[PDB]
Amino acid sequence: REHWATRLGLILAMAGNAVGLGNFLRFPVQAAENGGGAFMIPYIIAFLLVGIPLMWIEWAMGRYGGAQGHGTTPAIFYLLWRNRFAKILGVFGLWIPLVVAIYYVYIESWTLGFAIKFLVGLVPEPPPDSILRPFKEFLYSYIGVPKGDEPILKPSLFAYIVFLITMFINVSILIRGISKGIERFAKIAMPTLFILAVFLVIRVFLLETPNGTAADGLNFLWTPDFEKLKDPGVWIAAVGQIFFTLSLGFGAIITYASYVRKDQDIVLSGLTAATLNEKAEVILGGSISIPAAVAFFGVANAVAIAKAGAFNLGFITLPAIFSQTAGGTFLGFLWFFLLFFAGLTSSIAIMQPMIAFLEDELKLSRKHAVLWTAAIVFFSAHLVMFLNKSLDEMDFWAGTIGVVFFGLTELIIFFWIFGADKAWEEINRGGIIKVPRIYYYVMRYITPAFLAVLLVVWAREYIPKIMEETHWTVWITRFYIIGLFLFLTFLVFLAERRRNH
Numbered sequence: 001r002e003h004w005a006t007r008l009g010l011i012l013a014m015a016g017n018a019v020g021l022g023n024f025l026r027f028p029v030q031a032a033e034n035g036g037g038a039f040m041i042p043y044i045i046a047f048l049l050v051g052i053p054l055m056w057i058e059w060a061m062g063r064y065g066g067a068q069g070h071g072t073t074p075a076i077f078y079l080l081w082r083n084r085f086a087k088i089l090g091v092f093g094l095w096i097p098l099v100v101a102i103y104y105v106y107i108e109s110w111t112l113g114f115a116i117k118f119l120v121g122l123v124p125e126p127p128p129d130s131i132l133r134p135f136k137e138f139l140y141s142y143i144g145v146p147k148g149d150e151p152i153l154k155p156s157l158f159a160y161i162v163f164l165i166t167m168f169i170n171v172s173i174l175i176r177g178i179s180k181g182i183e184r185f186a187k188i189a190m191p192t193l194f195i196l197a198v199f200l201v202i203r204v205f206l207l208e209t210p211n212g213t214a215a216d217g218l219n220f221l222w223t224p225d226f227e228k229l230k231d232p233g234v235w236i237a238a239v240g241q242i243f244f245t246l247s248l249g250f251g252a253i254i255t256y257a258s259y260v261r262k263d264q265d266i267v268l269s270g271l272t273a274a275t276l277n278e279k280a281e282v283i284l285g286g287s288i289s290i291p292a293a294v295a296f297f298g299v300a301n302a303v304a305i306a307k308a309g310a311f312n313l314g315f316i317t318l319p320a321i322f323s324q325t326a327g328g329t330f331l332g333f334l335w336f337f338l339l340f341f342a343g344l345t346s347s348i349a350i351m352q353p354m355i356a357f358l359e360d361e362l363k364l365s366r367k368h369a370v371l372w373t374a375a376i377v378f379f380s381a382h383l384v385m386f387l388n389k390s391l392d393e394m395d396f397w398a399g400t401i402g403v404v405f406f407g408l409t410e411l412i413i414f415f416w417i418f419g420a421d422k423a424w425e426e427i428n429r430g431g432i433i434k435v436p437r438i439y440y441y442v443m444r445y446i447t448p449a450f451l452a453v454l455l456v457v458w459a460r461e462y463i464p465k466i467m468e469e470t471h472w473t474v475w476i477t478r479f480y481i482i483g484l485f486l487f488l489t490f491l492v493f494l495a496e497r498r499r500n501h
């Protein structure tokens with residue numbers, strides 16, 4: 001089996017897995033829409049009660065799986081629970097990261113496209129709405145937002161070609177393997193990512209207009225609002241963000257952990273990777289978009305902008321703000337270059353589970369596993385590129401509801417079916433430090449009850465609206481992703497047949 005070469009390489013690759021587009025694009029939007037500091041309390045709580053325990057659980061399952069030659073959940077779920085149904089539930093741990101990858105790599109390619117255009121200065125120029133409109137139109141031409149009745153997207157030729165280059169970049173890393181590809185790239189990307197982010201945070205701090213400063217944005221984000229801790233919509237938002245941001249329930253952490261040696265520590269390593277992400281999220285990610293928006297527009301306007309769109313902040317508002325400053329075009333470039341490296345280190349992570357399945361279970365070489373995985377993702381992404389609201393549908397079913405459901409599933413299998421005491425032992429085995437004894441009770445009683453309650457409220461108060469009050473074209477996307485599940489179910493069926501022959 002492939003293994004991580006260095007300790008630091010492992011940490012940086014795992015942090016590169018988590019530290020992604022979610023830190024800089026998803027988190028600011030979620031927080032702004034949920035009363036800033038009103039969001040943070042549920043967020044911190046969810047991090048302590050859901051994020052941390054599941055991180056250790058996924059590292060545990062991965063290392064346990066890898067020791068026996070299996071990187072993905074179809075096989076790992078079966079190892080923990082010798083039942084046919086465990087293999088089928090395990091498909092979600094291939095399905096989720098595949099579907100997520102299908103739209104994620106595409107968003108990632110927008111950041112490269114924008115980076116290029118901002119570096120070369122092929123960007124709009126201002127002559128409040130006269131400031132935003134040219135940048136709105138710039139993004140709308142790029143991705144091809146529908147102008148009329150038809151739910152059809154028309155991406156520019158540049159966007160399409162940049163998507164191809166992005167696929168090629170992802171492949172060039174992944175084809176070199178774990179230590180020589182993913183690890184080596186992480187050691188380059190992460191320091192760069194941190195430097196650019198710190199630079200941009202510092203630069204944003206210096207912004208002031210007659211409407212406010214950056215500090216006003218931080219005050220909005222860090223003033224606890226106790227009159228919102230009763231809204232279930234905020235708690236759903238916070239827990240969802242925690243899963244997405246930490247790459248939990250994507251089977252991606254598990255797959256990375258399957259290249260960790262049987263004896264090596266996962267307790268401190270896991271905690272470090274999780275804490276590195278939260279610092280990049282709340283300190284770095286939280287200090288760029290919102291404070292800049294609040295500084296130019298005030299709190300009320302910044303929230304309203306964050307509500308009328310989620311790519312409004314990162315692709316429209318921020319570059320618009322930057323263009324009003326000296327060297328703003330280059331500042332835009334640094335923003336989009338930061339985003340590109342944030343995305344890239346995470347997109348290689350959510351394609352690796354499919355690659356590892358093909359290698360481990362169907363005994364394909366790395367070359368063919370990577371190329372076939374890329375081909376599947378490349379082809380499928382045409383739905384995201386050309387069909388309006390296809391991105392939102394995949395992001396909901398796989399990257400939002402799917403991950404929470406899968407987190408609960410993997411927790412139940414590992415802690416309730418495999419055995420709580422066996423699970424605990426497997427977590428702590430070889431650890432530099434031990435997990436606090438309190439977390440056993442959290443993992444076994446608190447976390448599962450909390451997620452189960454959350455999913456029941458979710459499926460009764462929120463999913464009826466999405467199932468019923470959306471455009472008919474969502475069924476094309478639903479149909480296709482259900483098809484992907486059946487296809488993956490079929491590959492698992494072939495994998496066990498091949499094992500017998």
Ligand SMILES: CNCC[C@H](Oc1ccc(C(F)(F)F)cc1)c1ccccc1
Pocket residue numbers: 021022023025026029030104107309310311392395
């Ligand atoms: C414009 N429609 C998309 C809604 C938006 O989707 C997103 C999907 C992916 C990402 C990112 F960039 F991957 F983090 C960020 C946002 C979203 C989803 C959930 C919560 C906030 C925003």
Ligand SMILES: CC(C)C[C@H](N)C(=O)O
Pocket residue numbers: 017018019020021022023100104244245246247250252346347349350
């Ligand atoms: C799907 C995951 C790899 C996403 C990543 N954790 C992020 O915050 O962008």
Ligand code: NA
Pocket residue numbers: 018019020022023244245246247277281
């Ligand atoms: Na993250």
Ligand code: NA
Pocket residue numbers: 015016017018019020021341342343344345346347
């Ligand atoms: Na990343």
